[PDB]
Amino acid sequence: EQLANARRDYEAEIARARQEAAKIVAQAQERAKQQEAEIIAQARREAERLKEEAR
Amino acid sequence: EQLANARRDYEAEIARARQEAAKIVAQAQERAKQQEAEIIAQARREAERLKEEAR
């Protein structure tokens, strides 16, 4: 009975850790991609506008 | 007593598994916020770097 309980506890703990990692990793990538995309777009718009103004 | 404790251990394993599952979600939410903030901070530096390159 104790061995079966340990097996059930190990499976639940591993699944909980796996679920925790997936949610945390996805949030970091989503936030970084959203933040990085805005960085490139902001510079691209300014560069195009500045080139016409300087000319 | 061991037989009685075995039933208690089986119940303890279920209780510990639920506690770990709640802790995993709590750890994931805390980790995701820090991971997103750290990635945003690096991308914010890149945004200034992209703006500096554009200027």
Curated annotation (Swiss-Prot), chains A, B:
F-type ATPases have 2 components, F(1) - the catalytic core - and F(0) - the membrane proton channel. F(1) has five subunits: alpha(3), beta(3), gamma(1), delta(1), epsilon(1). F(0) has four main subunits: a(1), b(2) and c(10-14). The alpha and beta chains form an alternating ring which encloses part of the gamma chain. F(1) is attached to F(0) by a central stalk formed by the gamma and epsilon chains, while a peripheral stalk is formed by the delta and b chains. F(1)F(0) ATP synthase produces ATP from ADP in the presence of a proton or sodium gradient. F-type ATPases consist of two structural domains, F(1) containing the extramembraneous catalytic core and F(0) containing the membrane proton channel, linked together by a central stalk and a peripheral stalk. During catalysis, ATP synthesis in the catalytic domain of F(1) is coupled via a rotary mechanism of the central stalk subunits to proton translocation. Component of the F(0) channel, it forms part of the peripheral stalk, linking F(1) to F(0). Belongs to the ATPase B chain family. It is found in: Cell membrane. This is ATP synthase subunit b. It comes from Chloroflexus aurantiacus (strain ATCC 29366 / DSM 635 / J-10-fl). It comes from the Bacteria.
